[PDB]
Amino acid sequence: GRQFGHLTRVRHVITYSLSPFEQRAFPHYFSKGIPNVLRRTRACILRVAPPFVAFYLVYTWGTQEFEKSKRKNPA
Amino acid sequence: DEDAVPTLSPCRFTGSQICHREDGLPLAHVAIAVEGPGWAHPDNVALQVANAIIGHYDCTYGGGAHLSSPLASIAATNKLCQSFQTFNICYADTGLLGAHFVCDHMSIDDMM
């Protein structure tokens, strides 16, 4: 169990804070928010997306093949 | 006498926090205040009555346990404190009303 006062040594850092009653809960919510999510998407797409597309392609091939395997044409 | 004077514009109070963290320093200083009224205001007197009840303390006072103020008594008994003081600082139409204290790093939460 860790407690405040016993965590670590910090020197020379000033924190400035405002009361929640003095300030906005949703400051510039769309105007700053949607640029940020767009920037976050860009930052991660190339890592996240290409495995799932590679699943989707194996999904769509695999379903198509199995469907087409369960048919004859000569006997 | 002559043209261009200003009178004093009123000063907005903000509920806020400044935290100068410095672990090299042997004791913590905390000051906490709500918005007082001005110099002029009649209820400065009753606020001062109230502040006297909380009082002041210092580690060189006689009376640990027996002091009338419950803050002073508990701060002395439980070693919460090197000092505290109540204050009512007055400006025109605003003030700083509350308390300042000096204590060990493991005593700030209890003192508050």
Q: Structural domain of residue A30, as residue ranges?
A: 1-75
CA-to-CA distance for B14 and A75, rounded, in angstroms?
A: 89
User: What residues of A are in contact with residue B14 (Cβ under 8 Å)?
Assistant: 18-19, 22
CA-to-CA distance for B100 and B30, rounded, in angstroms?
A: 6
Within 8 A by CB and 6+ apart from B107, the residues are: B28, B79, B80, B81
The answer to whether B73 and B36 are in contact (CB under 8 A) is no
CA-to-CA distance for B76 and B57, rounded, in angstroms?
A: 8
The answer to whether B3 and A7 are in contact (CB under 8 A) is no
Q: Letter for the amino acid at A17? A: S
Tokens found for residue B33: 């205040």
Q: Do A22 and B15 touch (CB under 8 A)?
A: yes
Q: Which helix (H) or strand (E) holds B17?
A: strand B16-22
DSSP A17: E
Q: Do A14 and B21 touch (CB under 8 A)?
A: yes
Q: How many domains does chain A have?
A: 1
Within 8 A by CB and 6+ apart from A19, the residues are: B14, B15, B16
The experimental technique used to determine this model is X-ray
Give the residues after which the backbone of chain A is interrupted, taking a C-to-next-N distance over 2.5 angstroms as a break.
none
Residue B57 bridge partners (DSSP): B84
State the smallest CA–CA distance between residue B27 and chain A in angstroms: 12
